[PDB]
Write a protein that binds this DNA or RNA. Sequence first.
DNA 1: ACAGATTTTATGTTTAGATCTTTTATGCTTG
DNA 2: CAAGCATAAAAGATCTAAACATAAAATCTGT
Lengths: 130, 295, 557
Amino acid sequence: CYETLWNKVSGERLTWAASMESLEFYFKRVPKNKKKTIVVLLDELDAMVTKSQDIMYNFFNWTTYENAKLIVIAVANTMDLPERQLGNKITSRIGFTRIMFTGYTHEELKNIIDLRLKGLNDSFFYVDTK
Amino acid sequence: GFSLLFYGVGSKRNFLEEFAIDYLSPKIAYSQLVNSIPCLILNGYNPSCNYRDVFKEITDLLVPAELTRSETKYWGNHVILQIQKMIDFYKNQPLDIKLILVVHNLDGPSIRKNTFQTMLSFLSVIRQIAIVASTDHIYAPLLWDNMKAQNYNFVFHDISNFEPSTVESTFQDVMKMGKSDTSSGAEGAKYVLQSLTVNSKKMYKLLIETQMQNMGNLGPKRGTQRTGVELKLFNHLCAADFIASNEIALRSMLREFIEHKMANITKNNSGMEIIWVPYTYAELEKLLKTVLNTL
Amino acid sequence: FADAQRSHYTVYPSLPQSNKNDKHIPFVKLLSGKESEVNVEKRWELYHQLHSHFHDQVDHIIDNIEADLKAEISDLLYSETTQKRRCFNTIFLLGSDSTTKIELKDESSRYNVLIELTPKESPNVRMMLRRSMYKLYSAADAEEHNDVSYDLSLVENFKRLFGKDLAMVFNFKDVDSINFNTLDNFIILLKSAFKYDHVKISLIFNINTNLSNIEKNLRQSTIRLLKRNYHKLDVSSNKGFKYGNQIFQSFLDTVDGKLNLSDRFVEFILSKMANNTNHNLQLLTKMLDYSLMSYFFQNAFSVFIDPVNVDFLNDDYLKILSRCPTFMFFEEFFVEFLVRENPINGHAKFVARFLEEELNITNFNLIELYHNLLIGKLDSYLDRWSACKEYKDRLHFEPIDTIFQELFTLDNRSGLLTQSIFPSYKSNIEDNLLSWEQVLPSLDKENYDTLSGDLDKIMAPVLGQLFKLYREANMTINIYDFYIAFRETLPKEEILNFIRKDPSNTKLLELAETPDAFDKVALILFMQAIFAFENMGLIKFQSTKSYDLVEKCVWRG
DNA sequence: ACAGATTTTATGTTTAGATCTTTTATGCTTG
DNA sequence: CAAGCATAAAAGATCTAAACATAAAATCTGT
């Protein structure tokens, strides 16, 4: 996931270590005058951390730098993934907005289904028996 | 060509060191002829003594020839094969000693295992090095077979002076009489870290705490590589705490810990550097709460 | 840092710039440092020349042994076997140390590949096979100057690959150590390589104990397969007694009549030789060399071995030698009874040669014969064969008639020889520990100057004092009662007085006023001593969750 | 400055060493 | 004494980290 980001922000192809150092140097030393903001959607962060505990730290630390203009939108299943994985001190020294999603109620799911069939419910169709 | 052994009650560490460093080396240097003969002294009472590092020192000092690809054999141990090649090479060199390998407490915790004993057995056949050793255990001669006794070619000598062995008891606890975690080696780490440096203690505390966090994320287990801390992660954490500014200072001050086996640095399968402490989680917590936590 | 806390740290000492011409010599001036330096130098050079003379012959004998065994095994390997190519010939080397370079003869049409396998390099069958095939491929390619997978099919394709026949010889270095399940499976696997009619296999088993263990462990079918061609070959340094005799004769000639062997010394040689068979010749060489170097070291008269320096006798030499018991019982007087060479060595060599040429007796120990001749019961050793009855008339030997042999002899009367090569390790430890009086010297000249001139004499060292009670203790010992007894054996007021004797320290005197200061310093000493015992293995501890009991491991004597 | 020499990332392959878990060889213990 | 009861240690499942190993792409070195 490192090199992909680099390959999507730099057009070059680098290995994972070189991508790590390149992204860190681009998020740390390049002045804000000559950079364009990046929005990263770290979908399924659960699979990224595993034994490494490296991806998540790098991505939640690259947003701490003032030079870096990065809006990391991480998404996961377990609400307590950061505080467990990084530790209370690190998850406190990094201020990130936490959002929790609750499963839809019956009314909400009925509304979703009804909205997805607004154009077909109680409709007239011409059908040929042939 | 007689490797020499000292056995008896009391600590022979001071006596044997006095013999080898002050008397043996200058005298053999004078007789060979200038510089004194190097003296590799090997502390066997330390449970952190490793045979890989000992042979690394011996090959850094003596500098033997490398072994050819054919001589490597199919996955065979490189240390023993290199030693046998050294024996073959040294069977023709002039018979003048180029190193004395002092072995304190030859029957200690991490020095009595068969691998390092086999290494020393093959190493002592080399006439150009002198193997002076000391033993303490009563059943110490149980460690040597017929072949190992032949290769050692010992000449036992009795030294008994009832010395109190202050240095030997340092590496293990005495309040619990040493009955528990005798070969852990954490007590020596506590002793060496008690008064080392404030910044080194602080960064060691950071590393220990990160390792405990990783263990919790992952029963008392050893601190293996899978749970250790990444070098880049550690540098970032230290920079966030104004401990080590850059790579150079951190590596320079960490080499001291690496050489004393309080920590180890390896490379993961993906190539990421990892630094870890090989102590048990309970031992790590005790070390944190007894010396680290007092600041 | 603390260097004592390190491990395997090299140290380069700073040698002093002060030096002399020839002060650098291990030999020291004997007779209270009265002998001249020229005598010491002459002793050093004669020792070196004699050591070289002995070890040259020892090396020649060793090389002869290696060459003879290699030639014999190579001859037995081929032996012009007419057996059909349906089984592999096996050679069981009975009691062979795994130190030999089995040479395979070069054949124009057949590669001869020696594949050596060891228990460390054979965890299981697949690794046995992979290592064997790698060695085969490497040796074949080196001889012959794409890749092939490491499996038995490399043997199948060998004739096609290299256009030559194959002969693989498997040398199992330590066949006793390998778990015989994997060895049996590997042999059964090798059995599958007989469908090719261009490959011949030869197995060599370096057995150490006997064939009884091989029969017991190996499967019956494998033994049946091996039995088709096996050759029990007994190769060993201790078999036949024909090699220890050569080394002993070499030593006897390198001392000639210049030196004499004491009866008790050769008895000790025989006793220590009888207690070891796997490695015998090397132990004998070590014992002889150590005795020789010790004799040249702690004997002052070794400088006078050759006649040329007999005139170099001084007043101190004659004064010391005047107390010789042989002289009491009995320059120019000494030489006329010194240059007389001992005929014992020549007679022994003649007897050995006479019996080994035409008397058709070979199984005899020249060391045993020499010891018996030294005692003087040569008939009791020559009558066992019951064949030299008509030759005993000319084999009679005139009894021992020699004088001044105390000064030129090889013996162990001070016990250094037995306590430096085969010491009573545990017994020595217990003898030193029980009677500490003879280990730590007792001094009273400077007891006034020392700070503890009244406490050193009264009491005993802590570790030995604890060992006294430990020996007088029971099999299982409660720690509390042991400490109670140790403290009761400890004097009370003297410890406190010793504590008060130091005014420099302040924490010690602060703790001194505490009423149980003695009761806790004694406890500290007890923990130190019990830790030292645990380190030395004298005592052991039971389940650490209880830790209230200990067991004695080693008993005295 | 162009091909060789060295390095960097990226596995595969055996050996040496670890802890968990299950079973069962040790003690503790009345007559 | 055996059963009961307890803890303990052997035998092995399950696994990892290290030593030993090869290889293709990109970097660093001399003419």
